[PDB]
Design an enzyme around this catalytic site. Sequence first.
Site, PDB file in Angstrom:
ATOM      1  N   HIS A   9       0.818  -1.190   0.000  1.00 39.17           N
ATOM      2  CA  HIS A   9       0.000   0.000   0.000  1.00 39.17           C
ATOM      3  C   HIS A   9       0.877   1.275   0.000  1.00 39.17           C
ATOM      4  O   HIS A   9       2.054   1.270   0.376  1.00 39.17           O
ATOM      5  CB  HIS A   9      -0.884   0.120   1.216  1.00 39.17           C
ATOM      6  CG  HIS A   9      -1.760  -1.056   1.453  1.00 39.17           C
ATOM      7  ND1 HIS A   9      -2.726  -1.315   0.488  1.00 39.17           N
ATOM      8  CD2 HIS A   9      -1.805  -1.966   2.448  1.00 39.17           C
ATOM      9  CE1 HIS A   9      -3.372  -2.376   0.940  1.00 39.17           C
ATOM     10  NE2 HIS A   9      -2.870  -2.801   2.132  1.00 39.17           N
ATOM     11  N   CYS A  38      -4.928   4.711  -2.549  1.00 40.80           N
ATOM     12  CA  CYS A  38      -3.740   3.807  -2.549  1.00 40.80           C
ATOM     13  C   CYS A  38      -3.535   3.526  -4.042  1.00 40.80           C
ATOM     14  O   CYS A  38      -4.493   2.953  -4.645  1.00 40.80           O
ATOM     15  CB  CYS A  38      -3.963   2.557  -1.707  1.00 40.80           C
ATOM     16  SG  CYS A  38      -2.757   1.276  -1.963  1.00 40.80           S
ATOM     17  N   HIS A  72      -3.919  -0.203  -5.481  1.00 44.25           N
ATOM     18  CA  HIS A  72      -5.280  -0.695  -5.356  1.00 44.25           C
ATOM     19  C   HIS A  72      -6.359   0.304  -5.684  1.00 44.25           C
ATOM     20  O   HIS A  72      -7.463   0.211  -5.114  1.00 44.25           O
ATOM     21  CB  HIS A  72      -5.434  -1.108  -3.875  1.00 44.25           C
ATOM     22  CG  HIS A  72      -4.468  -2.238  -3.601  1.00 44.25           C
ATOM     23  ND1 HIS A  72      -3.752  -2.281  -2.404  1.00 44.25           N
ATOM     24  CD2 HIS A  72      -4.123  -3.282  -4.390  1.00 44.25           C
ATOM     25  CE1 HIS A  72      -3.004  -3.345  -2.507  1.00 44.25           C
ATOM     26  NE2 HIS A  72      -3.206  -3.986  -3.657  1.00 44.25           N
ATOM     27  N   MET A 117      -9.792   1.414  -3.219  1.00 45.99           N
ATOM     28  CA  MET A 117      -9.097   1.685  -1.927  1.00 45.99           C
ATOM     29  C   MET A 117      -8.801   3.196  -1.844  1.00 45.99           C
ATOM     30  O   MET A 117      -7.757   3.707  -2.279  1.00 45.99           O
ATOM     31  CB  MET A 117      -7.849   0.792  -1.714  1.00 45.99           C
ATOM     32  CG  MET A 117      -7.130   1.081  -0.446  1.00 45.99           C
ATOM     33  SD  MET A 117      -5.979  -0.158   0.135  1.00 45.99           S
ATOM     34  CE  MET A 117      -5.252   0.732   1.524  1.00 45.99           C
TER      35      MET A 117
HETATM   36 CU   LIG Z   1      -3.381  -0.568  -1.125  1.00 43.30          CU
END
Ligand SMILES: [Cu+2]
Lengths: 98, 98, 98, 98
Positions: free
Chosen positions: B38, B83, B86, B91
């Site tokens: 992340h 993020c 993602h 996210m």
């Molecule tokens: Cu992530």
Amino acid sequence: AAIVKLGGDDGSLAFVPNNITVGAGESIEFINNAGFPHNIVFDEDAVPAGVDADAISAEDYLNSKGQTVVRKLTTPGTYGVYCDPHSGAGMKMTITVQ
Amino acid sequence: AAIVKLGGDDGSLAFVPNNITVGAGESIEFINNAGFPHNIVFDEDAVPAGVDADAISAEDYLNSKGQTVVRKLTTPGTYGVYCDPHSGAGMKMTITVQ
Amino acid sequence: AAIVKLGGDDGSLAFVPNNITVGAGESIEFINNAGFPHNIVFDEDAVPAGVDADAISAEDYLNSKGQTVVRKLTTPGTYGVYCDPHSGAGMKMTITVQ
Amino acid sequence: AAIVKLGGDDGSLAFVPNNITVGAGESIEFINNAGFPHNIVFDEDAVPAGVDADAISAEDYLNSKGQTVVRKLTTPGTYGVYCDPHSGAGMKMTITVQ
Ligand SMILES: [Cu+2]
Ligand SMILES: [Cu+2]
Ligand SMILES: [Cu+2]
Ligand SMILES: [Cu+2]
């Protein structure tokens, strides 16, 4: 949702598969498999007009098995993708968007 | 001091919680939890006027459990965070500063 | 050759020591100790005239114990250094060059 | 195909060997060996005219044993390479292309 593995089970420095067709807005999951490190770079010279290659790339190195990068593409066309670290090895793919 | 976990205990690719309210100058702690890797990217188009999104982001990948990134925000307003890896998975979060 | 630890033995998000004096051309060794991840960013607004802060920084994350970054500074003056990830935590130092 | 190890078996912060001659289009394999982290930066001031140093570099940190970066060089000349993290330590090499 399309799945692309980074590195072959045999350790080949390839995108598996290296050719895929997805719908616009369909999730593409890149899963770190073998032959670390890898990254996903969209080729500046081989993406559709108006697409910002830098925004869809994921340049930081993926160094562990199972790590996932998820992307959604909306502009139809072909997209040339390569792994920077292993560019010299021919680690590249083509994503066709509809 | 506000705590935000990166990845759900169930492995969801989410900021937990994905909505938080903090005071100006209050410490925000992002703690790497699950579903690596992340990062924390402040959206260029969804931060207050005068805030330099690039300076408050933390773009290098967090690849281990327990890793922490600490930020302090002083300009009141809402901030869109996502993020990169993602992004395709939804996210993202919102930080409201007072 | 000056040694600076990244993270305190107690896990504090500090440069140990956070004040050091070195000679021009003297090796500075930054050793990853505890509280990962860390990086070494030379402050754009607190380095000597003519020094290129971006060139002396080491921005990629140090995620393992014992990892070392080695720098040599030649322009005399004070240099403000900080750890991006833990900027919010006050993880910064001053290097005086002679 | 030329092999260059990153870090000496004894832990020296060196490219082994630090001098190599390859043919144009010949594969160069950089294999992470010891003294992590390392990277491969082509010197802006010591590459042939027309070569884009940023494109042939591999800046993200290599933090594990056995990791490989593969490059192919086509413009004949000498190329100065260095490891950013260990620049202060003299970790640099020369690649001659024919
Ligand atoms: Cu992530
Ligand atoms: Cu790769
Ligand atoms: Cu730090
Ligand atoms: Cu090195």
